[PDB]
Amino acid sequence: RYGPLRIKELAVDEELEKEDGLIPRQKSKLCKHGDRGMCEYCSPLPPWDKEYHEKNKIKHISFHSYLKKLNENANKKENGSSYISPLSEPDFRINKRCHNGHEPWPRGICSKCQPSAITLQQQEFRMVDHVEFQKSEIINEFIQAWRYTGMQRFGYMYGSYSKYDNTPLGIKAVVEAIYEPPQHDEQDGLTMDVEQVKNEMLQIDRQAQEMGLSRIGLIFTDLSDAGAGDGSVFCKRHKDSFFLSSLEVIMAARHQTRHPNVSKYSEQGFFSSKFVTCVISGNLEGEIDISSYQVSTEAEALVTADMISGSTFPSMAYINDTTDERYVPEIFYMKSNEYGITVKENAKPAFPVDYLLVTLTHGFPNTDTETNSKFVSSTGFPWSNRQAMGQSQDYQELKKYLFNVASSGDFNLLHEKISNFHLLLYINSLQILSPDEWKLLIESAVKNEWEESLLKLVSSAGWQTLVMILQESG
Amino acid sequence: GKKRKDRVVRNNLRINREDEENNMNEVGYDDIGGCRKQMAQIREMVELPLRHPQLFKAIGIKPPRGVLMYGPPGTGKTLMARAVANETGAFFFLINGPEVMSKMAGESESNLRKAFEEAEKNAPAIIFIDEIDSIAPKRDKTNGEVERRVVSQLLTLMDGMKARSNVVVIAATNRPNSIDPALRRFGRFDREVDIGIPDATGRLEVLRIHTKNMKLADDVDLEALAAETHGYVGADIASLCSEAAMQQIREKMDLIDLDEDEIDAEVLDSLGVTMDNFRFALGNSNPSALRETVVESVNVTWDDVGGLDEIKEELKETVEYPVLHPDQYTKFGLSPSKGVLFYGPPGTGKTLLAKAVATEVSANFISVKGPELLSMWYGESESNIRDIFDKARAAAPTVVFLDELDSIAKDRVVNQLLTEMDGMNAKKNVFVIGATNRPDQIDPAILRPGRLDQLIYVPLPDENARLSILNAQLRKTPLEPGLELTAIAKATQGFSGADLLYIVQRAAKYAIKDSIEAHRQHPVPYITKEHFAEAMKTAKRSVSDAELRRYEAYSQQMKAS
Ligand SMILES: Nc1ncnc2c1ncn2[C@@H]1O[C@H](COP(=O)(O)OP(=O)(O)OP(=O)(O)O)[C@@H](O)[C@H]1O
Ligand SMILES: Nc1ncnc2c1ncn2[C@@H]1O[C@H](COP(=O)(O)OP(=O)(O)O)[C@@H](O)[C@H]1O
Ligand SMILES: [Zn+2]
Ligand SMILES: [Zn+2]
What we know:
The structure is cut from a larger assembly and holds chains A and B.
Chain A: H1 11-18, H2 50-55, H3 64-73, E1 118-120, E2 130-133, H4 136-149, E3 154-164, E4 170-179, E5 184-185, E6 190-191, H5 194-211, E7 215-221, H6 246-257, E8 276-280, E9 290-295, H7 297-304, E10 309-310, E11 316-318, E12 331-336, E13 342-346, E14 350-352, E15 357-363, H8 395-401, H9 404-408, H10 411-418, H11 421-430, H12 435-445, H13 451-459, H14 461-472
Parallel strand pairs in A: 1-12, 2-4, 2-15, 7-8
Antiparallel strand pairs in A: 3-4, 3-7, 5-6, 8-9, 9-15, 10-11, 11-14, 12-13
Chain B: H1 8-13, H2 17-21, H3 36-51, H4 53-59, E1 66-70, H5 77-88, E2 91-96, H6 97-101, H7 108-121, E3 125-130, H8 145-161, E4 167-173, E5 191-194, H9 200-210, H10 222-228, H11 234-252, H12 265-268, H13 275-284, E6 295-296, H14 309-324, H15 326-332, E7 339-343, H16 350-360, E8 364-368, H17 370-378, H18 385-394, E9 398-402, H19 412-422, E10 430-436, E11 454-457, H20 463-473, H21 486-491, H22 497-521, H23 529-537, H24 545-560
Parallel strand pairs in B: 1-4, 1-5, 2-3, 3-4, 7-10, 7-11, 8-9, 9-10
Antiparallel strand pairs in B: 6-8
Helix pairs in contact in B: 3-4, 7-8, 9-10, 9-11, 11-13, 14-15, 20-22, 22-23
The complex binds adenosine-5'-triphosphate, adenosine-5'-diphosphate and zinc ion (ZN) (2 copies).
Residues 31, 33, 38-39, 41-42 of chain A line the site of one zinc ion.
């Protein structure tokens, strides 16, 4: 297209692209030159300088900085080319139609459409840098689920992305709420039919988009109780053990492949979904520390063409066998030894998954800053699908929870009770409220300057009917 | 005020302290002497595109980007570039070749790209690439993949900058052939500047500049030092000054104690450099510029060459009229002679005549002695015939004086010289003089038209020539008052200039011997006639009769044809 592709993407990408991120440096004591004129040590440091990152204890390079590096590496202006897209998502599937004179793969292949050997290697750029939980309650309730039932859990985490000043051109995913799909949790694992999950999540995500959220990851708990007097949990995931066994890696790769990130610098228009997965395991001590991870782009394009399956060894992923419709070339994984030489080891029977991951830094908002949480809620109306526990959404709980506040007034108190994510979802599910009335409800419950909108809402006949039936109902 | 600066005020305007004291940069045009031509060329190529770009827009031309600058090491190339950069008062990005080549693979290209991009950001800019021969060497010598990668990166960046940009690139190298040839085409390092050894005035200026802070003694005769020092590049002069200071310190060490950490200030006040210190430094100096062919600066006139009046006027007509009066040649459409070859017995003073001719048109001079030609033939020398002619072109007008040409022209070198001569630009005023003692032994191919076709015979001096030579040689030597040399001249019929110089040297040696013996036994301010008489008695003609007869027969045969 005679230049860079034309498409509209997230605002974070645009604003990051506008910046250049150069880190200025002052006159070094080793310079030999007048005030003006910078020689080699006084020049600005590019944002992708690996030395700075590894010197500041940052293990990855804030993907946008990687994009800047790639653009600088080539694509001279005014001449030298007609623009070559610098980013391309690797694809391993055999070209079903090459036809230099041969027939399709099932009964014929040439050397031009043969998937070349794949060299697994740890990725160097992580798309999303910092995953941030707005409030401790959001995950405290989730862990309380396990406390009460004892079984594991699993839930998507909606939220939005923004800049992250602490890292060069870094991004942070702020999670606002957690929604628990219908799943059959158990002592050692959890199970859930994919069809129901996707069907439900389609409408749930539509409603969330209407509210201004977005599905930005999945969080599951892998916790076991220790023998100490208090509540302590073993640390089964450390350097020696497996950080993430095969199956969770596979599921994360599938999820990433199904949540592509739209980008302006690829032929297809997408690259390396901004999807973050969080796991709760417990730190070296008995705490309930959390963690974050993200499977690299090669693993993203590796699971799509099958080629991987779980192995009885937790820390290693099995490799499948060649067959029609699935061609699996030799997989070499590259590591580094203590002598500073890269070694390629063939691992067909099984290979560790440490080369298919990048780790993110979890955290919580500073407790001495402005509060921009969408929802001051999540300690109230029980969450959606806690049928296994006693929690159950229904008229009676609404009557017990959100009746006395509305029946009198005190709108300041009411607002916080109306800004609860699951409450909004439930009332929308009832379908009592009219579409536009619900739209103004969400605009009042997820936005400031809400006095007039809240008054209008309580004016609309829909809310009158809601409160009347709620009071009448036991 | 000056140096783009805007008692305290005067010091600030240049009209911890250690960081600036050791960083006394901003060396202006007052820190360079003896290179007025090269400095003027560099300033014209650099300042005007940056200071006054409007002229080029008005006329509608693209100012040259590259400015290659090559010369013998230690001649102040980097200092000159730094002075230009500071005086222009514009952004400039240093790049030292060894540093760029002393980094891990995959980062030298990054440094070069960053340099060029940054210089582009803050236009106007001046990128000074030092020791460019260390990052873009000749292809054959360095086949390393990384070197080829760096060369390709540099070429790409050089090509990609020539677009509405105010970036001027200055490069320094020892020889014009060391750099890869690909960096000497259109839109690249095309405009070249050659720096030659300074002359007497240049050496005097350099000594004046260096010896401004030193506490010189009142008995300093810098003129004598300039006259004595020949082939001294600036670095040699600086080392000479350092050696003189060290010698003075050693002489004054008798009144100082090594063990004591402190040194008396009164003793320090007595550190005065004397002419003796400079003479000792000259004794210990080791100049090396002449080891390679370089562009000199001759100043001989039509007074050191006696006789040869017909030859003098013929050379004037053949050389000066083209250079000085190209209008008439263009009017008549006559191509000036491209060279001339001198033949005759050795010691007749061919070199003096060639140097005088070169000085007449006020042009530089290049000397290529026979041993250097032989070394190039054996391939064990840095320079080359192509390099010699490239330097001649860059320093034009010039006179290239090939010496002992019979040694090589009894093959590869002869053919290469013929190629260089034929490919030379006829219009450009560059002349090739040749010296030989065996004109017949010279390869006939050289004497073809468009080459050293002109033949000039240099005869042995006559009585008047001998008298003139004796008078000239004894200018710097005292003689007995009222001493006549006509008798010596007539008694020395058939002798050559070398023989006369040997006679004078032997007479002076006897005089100094007598003076030393008398002083040791302890008066002889002059050289009495007995010294010259004995020297004449103890000298012999260096030319056998047979060679003279064959030379005159060959000359007569040439005349007859
Ligand atoms: N006019 C001059 N010409 C030459 N040298 C000079 C002149 N004036 C001063 N110098 C002194 O001569 C020496 C030249 O050193 P410089 O580093 O410039 O040499 P160079 O051979 O051109 O350098 P490089 O090969 O590192 O580019 C310095 O001592 C400088 O002070
Ligand atoms: N007019 C002159 N005629 C001849 N020789 C001279 C004259 N003036 C000076 N000389 C001396 O003659 C010598 C000639 O040296 P050179 O040119 O190297 O050898 P040649 O003259 O045989 O080419 C010089 O050392 C110089 O001192
Ligand atoms: Zn610097
Ligand atoms: Zn094919």
